[PDB]
Amino acid sequence: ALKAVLVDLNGTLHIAVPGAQEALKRLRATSVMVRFVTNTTKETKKDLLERLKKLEFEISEDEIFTSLTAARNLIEQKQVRPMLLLDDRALPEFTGVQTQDPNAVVIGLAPEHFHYQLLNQAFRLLLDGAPLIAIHKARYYKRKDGLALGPGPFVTALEYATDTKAMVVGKPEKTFFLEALRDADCAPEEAVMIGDDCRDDVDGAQNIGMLGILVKTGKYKAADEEKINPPPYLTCESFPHAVDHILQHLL
């Protein structure tokens, strides 16, 4: 009955977690589809794959899925020409997407685009009926010189200005999981997500009816499992442990 396993790529697989590359080879001995997922506004599948190959994982490219892929999929489903308020680094993920005469607004973390004039242009697309698509809505992030504005304040500004709500496509939001699961052509109920983040990874997956496994690596702190309802289907020490459980109980 288990058809797909989604695996967070950051803190679940490396900080390389010991046993991970072996545990994954073991998971592959089954027929389960394996997907490697992350929220990102900046990173390509090619870079992420690279980083994983360095670390001795056997992962192919068609297996990495991100916040950006979710946005490309939605773009292609809605058949819209987005204005891409994205870092120049994300744009390889949108090659072949039409952006001229735009009729949609896609917004990630794009400081160089996060100025009045270009924001006002986006505003006028939304007044005209353009859908607003947000990669995610984080208030801030940490950089070399301290906390800095993330994409969330700027999504909200556009939302405030137009009295509309963005479709958010990054974790914990439902779209991230449904698009990740799209290539397995399976129900969320027939999949599991493994992450070190009880909210973004595990609660997010379980809100659409996936089984969520919280691992005590990466950004996990003791009693994180207690902050969500219901609790994670399973909380365990690491990715190799998650995997043994899956082999035992779910396959």
Ligand SMILES: [Mg+2]
């Ligand atoms: Mg992570």
